[PDB]
């Protein structure tokens, strides 16, 4: 599945199949 969903958020570990999916999570998650 690290083949199918090779990208991951460094804070929560959520896995993503595509970079734009992670990009959106990264932009808006885990903020004050
Ligand atoms: Zn995260």
The rounded Å distance from CA 1 to ligand 1 centre is 18
Helix (H, G, I), strand (E, B) or coil at 22: helix
Residue 12 C-alpha from the chain's centroid: 8
19 CA to centre of ligand 1 in angstroms: 13
Between the alpha carbon of residue 1 and those of residues 11, 18, 29, 31, 32, the distances in Å are 19, 13, 23, 28, 31
Percent of the chain that is helix, strand, coil (3-state, to 5): 30, 10, 55
Residues in the chain, overall count: 32
Distance (Å) from CA 4 to ligand 1 centroid: 18
Burial class (CB in 10 A: 0-12, 13-18, 19+), 27: exposed
Whole-angstrom distance, CA of residue 24 vs CA of residue 17: 13
- Phi, psi dihedral angles at 19 (to 5 degrees): -65, -40
Distance (Å) from CA 10 to ligand 1 centroid? 6
Give the chain's domains with CATH numbers: 1-32 (3.30.160)
- C-alpha of residue 20 to centroid of ligand 1, in Å: 14
| Resolution to one decimal, Å | 1.8
Residue with tokens 């970079």: 19
């Amino acid at each position: 599945e690290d083949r199918d969903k090779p990208y991951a958020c460094d804070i929560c570990g959520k896995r993503y199949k595509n970079r734009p999916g992670l990009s959106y999570h990264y932009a808006h998650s885990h903020l004050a």
